Amino acid sequence: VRDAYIAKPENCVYECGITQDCNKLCTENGAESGYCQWGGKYGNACWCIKLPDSVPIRVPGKCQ
């Protein structure tokens, strides 16, 4: 597993600061940890700590 910017398909980010449940969603997904990254390359997004291969992250492209 490895840290990264967790997201939801199709290639879509997960805004935070309003839900404040990144740690829960991340953990449940199978990640070691997670939180709300307020200030990232693509703005505010739910960050994930230690994510399994099966659970990829947001990739550079369009959303569907």
Swiss-Prot record:
Single biological process term from Gene Ontology: envenomation resulting in negative regulation of voltage-gated sodium channel activity in another organism
GO MF annotation terms: potassium channel inhibitor activity; sodium channel inhibitor activity; toxin activity
Coiled-coil stretches noted in the UniProt entry, renumbered to this chain: none
Superkingdom field: Eukaryota
Family: Belongs to the long (4 C-C) scorpion toxin superfamily. Sodium channel inhibitor family. Alpha subfamily.
Domain notes: Has the structural arrangement of an alpha-helix connected to antiparallel beta-sheets by disulfide bonds (CS-alpha/beta).
Tissue and organ distribution: Expressed by the venom gland.
Stretches assigned to the LCN-type CS-alpha/beta domain: 2-64
Physiological role: Binds to voltage-dependent sodium channels (Nav) and voltage-dependent delayed rectifier potassium channels and inhibits the inactivation of the activated channels, thereby blocking neuronal transmission. Administration to mice at a dosage of 0.8 mg/kg produces an analgesic effect.
Location within or outside the cell: Secreted
Entry annotated with the keyword Metal-binding: no
Disulfide bonds: 12-63, 16-36, 22-46, 26-48
GO cellular component: extracellular region
Protein name per the record: Neurotoxin BmK-M10
Keywords: Disulfide bond, Ion channel impairing toxin, Neurotoxin, Secreted, Signal, Toxin, Voltage-gated sodium channel impairing toxin
Species in which this protein is naturally found: Olivierus martensii
